[PDB]
Design a binder for this molecule. Structure first.
Ligand code: CAC
Length: 144
């Protein structure tokens, strides 16, 4: 159906909301490997909060914060996700309710990562956007 990419719509919304300066965006254009929004985050040009916010607006997804998560994992399995994978992709299973896996995710526009999670777990997902470092903190607190 194919109108514009989720990343493109997020970048456009960052500009329009003035969470990103057009001068900064023009300077950003690879090469660590690095997606555009990744590079903006790494150059210090978009805050984690405004990244999360905008991802949530564009994709219509709920936002979840660190107040909402307890000190140890809730219960449930969950297969196919190594601790390393969680850390690399910055996402974290946080619960299972009505036959769906609640997944806290930094980069909900990344269809490669999501399709990886869908295939590895074999579970239907419910995506919740979280600030990158908050997800990282929970992964470590809950594991390693
Ligand atoms: C470890 As889980 C599926 O119960 O957040």
């Amino acid at each position: 159906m194919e109108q514009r990419s989720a990343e493109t719509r997020i970048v456009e919304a960052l500009l329009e909301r003035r969470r990103l300066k057009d001068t900064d965006l023009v300077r950003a254009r690879q090469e660590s490997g690095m997606g555009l929004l990744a590079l903006l985050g790494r150059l210090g040009l978009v805050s984690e909060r405004d990244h999360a916010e905008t991802c949530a607006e564009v994709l219509g997804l709920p936002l979840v914060d660190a107040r909402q998560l307890g000190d140890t994992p809730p219960e449930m399995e969950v297969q196919g996700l190594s601790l390393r994978f969680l850390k690399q992709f910055h996402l974290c299973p946080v619960g299972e309710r009505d036959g769906r896996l609640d997944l806290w995710i930094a980069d909900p526009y990344d269809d490669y990562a999501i399709d990886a999670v869908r295939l590895a777990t074999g579970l239907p997902l419910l995506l919740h956007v979280g600030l990158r470092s908050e997800i990282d903190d929970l992964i470590e607190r809950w594991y390693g």
